[PDB]
Amino acid sequence: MSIIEFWLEAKATIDRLIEQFLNSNRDWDLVDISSYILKDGKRFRGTLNMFFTVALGGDIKDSYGGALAIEILHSASLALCDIVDLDATRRGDKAAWVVYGNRKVIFITNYLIPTALRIIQTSYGDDALNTSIELWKDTSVGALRDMYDNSDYIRTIELKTGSLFKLSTVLSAYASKHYNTKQQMLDVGKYLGIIYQVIDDFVDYKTKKVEEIDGSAKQLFKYYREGKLEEYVRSVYLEYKQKYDELISNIPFQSKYLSEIRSLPEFLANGLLKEA
Amino acid sequence: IIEFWLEAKATIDRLIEQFLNSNRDWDLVDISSYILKDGKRFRGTLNMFFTVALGGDIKDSYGGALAIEILHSASLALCDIVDLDATRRGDKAAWVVYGNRKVIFITNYLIPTALRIIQTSYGDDALNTSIELWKDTSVGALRDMYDNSDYIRTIELKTGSLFKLSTVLSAYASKHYNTKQQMLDVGKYLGIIYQVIDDFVDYKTKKVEEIDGSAKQLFKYYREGKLEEYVRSVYLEYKQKYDELISNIPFQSKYLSEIRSLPEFLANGLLKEA
């Protein structure tokens, strides 16, 4: 839609911010590796940030700080996942650890996370920061529960992947000067994040070997082996999309963005499918 | 002098215990081995001492000391990270990956958990400073890798940072908010002393093919006996900055002496073990 065009502009805008961040970084030695980790990315979370900021009436410029922090928090998490799953490529590059070793990347990572938090606090204040610290903890709890994915698929992916989406959407509440939608915005990102992860796991079963699959995805095998994976994934997607559609009706969004807002679950769902 | 350390190091061990209990779920990644990697509790106690030493209850420091230690654990854990030589077999290496995995998960849980402890007890202002301090700790490690970086500056971020943390937190605890900026400097000097002193212990009772990091730079001191010369020259040197800032800070009466004994007790605490 215009969604795709908005995304392309946001990506370029977010890429610009990363460079300004990098160079302006006094820490001369940390730029080389930080750059490699922040290097590429579609920046979907950061653009959802900017998107909802504008859809709520705010000034796109006020979403910049969160936009940056988010993409910084995301990039740092990928560099870590690549270590956890021991993957050597990021879809067009060696993996950070391959090029610098687990030792450096993890430290660099423990530096970037606090940095992103500072940016969020400066740009938005203490309440925004505390919310971010809670979503950070949630995420770690998520990685954990991804260890023994016996049960709680939906809750597990909410914490693991959804936490960052909640951050993306909730921060647009501050950026747009509409803090009264805080909880509504948190639930928006929760629905989008669950939809994004469920679809992403699905695409994994249809584009990779059954053995090489692992993580939360692994919890869906029981559906896959019966040829009922698509059926389950579609149910989860319809549920949360309804929950989403209902919710955005009760949110003070600008009339001219409602159609784009209402088609976001499709934008993210078909976006993952397309590439695969 | 020690009438406190021994009694509090026991309180800390008791606190750390109730905590490790309300989080049995993380046993899956051997959380305790990280929380208990350190039994000393210097930073934790160092936080309770300087607190009361300002009229604060022994109570007000619980959160601080607990969070202080958790973060030290988080810090040590990061030291466990092993790079893959790729020269190992497939089996011998699967467990290194799982260790690196354990580190990454427990670390990213403890840190925000401790920060929330520091905020729930002392407010957003105490929270922000901690974030700054943890951020600096990470930088100390990155440069500790290698680049023969300014030993002093690189030692302040490595071990100092977390030391500045424990002191400055007593100020919030002691509700003597104005003594905030005062304490941050306390830890800084002590801290540079703890590490310089320690870095010296590895230069006396430690391997010849070992030594790395900051202590490395000392390369031009060991091969000429001047090593001990730089240590003494840096001990008193900074001890002076410490000895100065102390009396300036409105500590209190009953505990104004032993405080000057701290810069000594740390070194000896280390120089005795080896």
Contact B97 A108 (CB under 8 A): no
> Is A47 in contact with A80 (CB distance < 8 Å)?
no
Give me the resolution in angstroms, 1 decimal: 2.4
Per the structure, how many domains does chain B have? 1
Q: What is the 3-state secondary structure (H, E, C) of A47-72?
A: HHHHHHHHHCCCCHHHHHHHHHHHHH
Q: Look at residue B255 and give its three-state secondary structure.
A: coil
Q: CA-CA distance, B190 to A255, in Å (whole number)?
A: 60
Q: CA-CA distance, A80 to A85, in Å (whole number)?
A: 9
Contact A147 B109 (CB under 8 A): no
**Contact list, B119 vs chain A (CB under 8 Å):** 130, 133
> Is A81 in contact with A217 (CB distance < 8 Å)?
no
Q: Which member of B109, B132, B137 has the closest CB to residue A140?
A: B109
Q: Look at residue B22 and give its three-state secondary structure.
A: coil
Q: Which member of A80, A103, A104 has the closest CB to residue B104?
A: A80
Taking the CA atoms of B250, B254, B256 and B258 in sequence, report the sign of the dihedral they define.
negative
Q: CA-CA distance, A12 to B153, in Å (whole number)?
A: 37
Q: Which of B217-221's residues contact partners 24+ apart within 8 Å by CB, and which partners?
A: B217/B148, B217/B149, B217/B151, B218/B151
A106 interfaces chain B, CB cutoff of 8 Å = yes
B24 interfaces chain A, CB cutoff of 8 Å = no
> Is B238 in contact with B192 (CB distance < 8 Å)?
yes
Taking the CA atoms of A145, A162, B131 and A131 in sequence, report the sign of the dihedral they define.
negative
Question: Would you tell me how many other CB atoms lie within 10 Å of the CB of residue B95?
Answer: 12
Q: What token pair was written down for B24?
A: 């049995």
Contact A118 B132 (CB under 8 A): yes
Q: CA-CA distance, B234 to B248, in Å (whole number)?
A: 22
**Contact list, A137 vs chain B (CB under 8 Å):** 109, 112-113, 116
Q: How many contacts does A have with B, using Cβ atoms within 8 A?
A: 105
Burial grade of A99 (CB within 10 A; 0-12, 13-18, 19 or more): middle
**Contact list, A140 vs chain B (CB under 8 Å):** 105, 108-109, 112
Q: Which member of B112, B128, B143 has the closest CB to residue A137?
A: B112
Contact A107 B134 (CB under 8 A): no
B93 interfaces chain A, CB cutoff of 8 Å = no
DSSP result, A181-243: GHHHHHHHHHHHHHHHHHHHHHHHHTTS-TTT--TTGGGGHHHHTTT-HHHHHHHHHHHHHHH
Q: CA torsion, points A213, A219, A225, A226, in degrees to nearest 10?
A: -150
Q: CA-CA distance, B88 to B174, in Å (whole number)?
A: 52
A130 interfaces chain B, CB cutoff of 8 Å = yes
Residue A94 has what DSSP assignment?
B
Taking the CA atoms of B11, B13, B19 and B21 in sequence, report the sign of the dihedral they define.
negative
Distance from CA of A10 to the nearest CA of B (A): 29
Q: Which member of B82, B111, B145 has the closest CB to residue A104?
A: B145
Q: CA-CA distance, B258 to B265, in Å (whole number)?
A: 10
Provide the CATH number for the domain around residue A276: 1.10.600.10
- Closest residue by Cα to residue B136 from B168, B88, B101, B104: B168
**Contact list, B142 vs chain A (CB under 8 Å):** 29-30, 104, 107-108, 111
Whole domain around residue A219: which residue ranges?
1-276
- Closest residue by Cα to residue A169 from A85, A83, A77, A44: A44
Q: Which member of A29, A103, A136 has the closest CB to residue B147?
A: A29
**Contact list, A30 vs chain B (CB under 8 Å):** 139, 142
Taking the CA atoms of A127, A264, A165 and A20 in sequence, report the sign of the dihedral they define.
negative
Q: Which of B204-213's residues contact partners 24+ apart within 8 Å by CB, and which partners?
A: B204/B274, B205/B274, B206/B274, B212/B146, B213/B144, B213/B145, B213/B158
Residue type, A116: A
Contact A134 B112 (CB under 8 A): yes
Q: Which member of A83, A110, A133 has the closest CB to residue B78?
A: A110
Q: CA-CA distance, A46 to A102, in Å (whole number)?
A: 26
Residue A93 has what DSSP assignment?
S
Distance from CA of A11 to the nearest CA of B (A): 27
Contact B116 A102 (CB under 8 A): no
| Distance between first and last Cα of chain B | 22
Taking the CA atoms of A110, A115, A118 and A123 in sequence, report the sign of the dihedral they define.
negative
Q: Which of A97, A103, A145 to mutate to test the interface with B (most CBs of B within 10 A)?
A: A103
> Is A174 in contact with A125 (CB distance < 8 Å)?
yes
A167 interfaces chain B, CB cutoff of 8 Å = no
- Count of alpha carbons within 13 Å of A126, Cβ hemisphere only? 11
Distance from CA of A201 to the nearest CA of B (A): 21
A78 interfaces chain B, CB cutoff of 8 Å = no
**Contact list, A107 vs chain B (CB under 8 Å):** 78, 138, 141-142, 145
Query: Which secondary structure element, helix H or strand E, spans residue A107, and what is its range?
Result: helix A96-124
Quote helix, strand, coil % in chain A, to nearest 5. 80, 0, 20
B112 interfaces chain A, CB cutoff of 8 Å = yes
> Is A79 in contact with A109 (CB distance < 8 Å)?
yes
- Chain A, nearest residue to B23 by Cα: A141
> Is A134 in contact with A162 (CB distance < 8 Å)?
no
